[PDB]
Write a structure and sequence with these properties.
The protein has a single domain, classed as Alpha/Beta hydrolase fold, catalytic domain (Rossmann fold), CATH 3.40.50. Helices cover about 40% and strands about 15% of the residues. It is built from eleven helices and eight strands. Strand 5, helix 4 and strand 6 form a beta-alpha-beta unit. The PDB classes it as hydrolase. Keywords: alpha/beta hydrolase, carboxylesterase, hydrolase.
């Protein structure tokens, strides 16, 4: 199983789950309230026990503390993650992220003295989509999906239905225990005037691509192919791939057989291993 630990950072305590082993698979979630280990259970459960695991919950999500993020920058969050990296023994790692976790991931791989062996992205947020806004008409299909989900209940029920289809009843309930715990803590602060639930991105955060030296495996729904082909998440590495699959944004829930297949292939052929 995974060891739970609140690790100290300049941003205050950060919830982590950890398993020894080298290289270490480091997980970062998208925007949401799910705890990261729960969020990525279908990938974590499938990795060989010999492989390390580190999951990290962002502030105001999962079991990390709630706090105002108004004065927090991506650099601050990246520095906190790097402190967390230094807290554990692994010497090399792969980053596996969903959605907004892509932004931190790019800086981490560019700044960490530990060796990155690979990036695994499940619809990582691009500067392009970010500038436009997820669900902003750029993609008519995203605009229609968002428009269908009128109410908070609709949006919640959509996630509930989706997760229900892709997790065991046990991992489903656990996933939602984290969501509900997070939302409960958020009730105390989210209606306060100055409160910002997440750090704001700036232009200075959009100037980093992935090194040519690091293989990248990106998974995305087919309609986003061009965006990703032109994106900061792809490079010319002989092992880098763009895999088109899935019917929704949560590929780390539903496409883990395919993800594991690509991951195993990446590791078996990596000249730094």
């Amino acid at each position: 199983a995974l060891n739970k630990e609140m690790v100290n950072t300049l941003l205050g305590p950060i919830y982590t789950c950890h398993r020894e082993g080298n290289p270490c698979f480091v997980f970062l979630s998208g925007a949401g309230f799910f705890s990261t280990a729960d969020n990525f259970a279908n990938i974590i459960d499938k990795l060989p026990d010999s492989i390390g695991i580190l999951t990290i919950d962002a502030p105001n999500s999962g079991y990390s503390p709630v706090s105002n993020q108004a004065n927090v920058g991506l650099r601050d969050w990246v520095n906190a993650i790097l402190m967390i990296f230094e807290h554990f023994k692994f010497q090399s790692y792969l980053l596996c992220v969903h959605s907004i976790g892509g932004f931190a991931a790019l800086q981490i791989m560019n700044q960490s003295s530990k060796a990155c062996l690979g990036f695994i992205g499940l619809e990582p947020t691009t500067v392009m989509i970010y500038r436009a806004g997820f669900s902003s008409d750029l993609y008519p299909q995203l605009a229609l999906r968002r428009q269908k989900l009128k109410t908070a209940a609709d949006r919640l029920n959509y996630l509930k239905d989706l997760s229900r289809s892709h997790f065991s009843s046990q991992q489903f309930k656990q996933l939602w225990r984290g969501y509900d715990y997070c939302q409960r803590q958020l009730n105390d602060v989210q209606s306060l005037p100055d409160f910002k639930i997440r750090l704001a991105l700036g232009e200075e955060d959009f100037k980093t691509g992935i090194s040519e030296k690091i293989p990248s495996i990106v998974f995305s729904e087919s309609f986003r192919e061009k965006e990703y082909l032109e994106s900061e998440y792809l490079n010319k590495h002989t092992q880098t791939k763009l895999i088109l699959c899935g019917q929704h944004h949560y590929l780390h829930w539903s496409e883990t057989n395919s993800i594991l297949e690509k991951v195993e292939q990446l590791l078996s052929n990596h000249e730094k291993l």
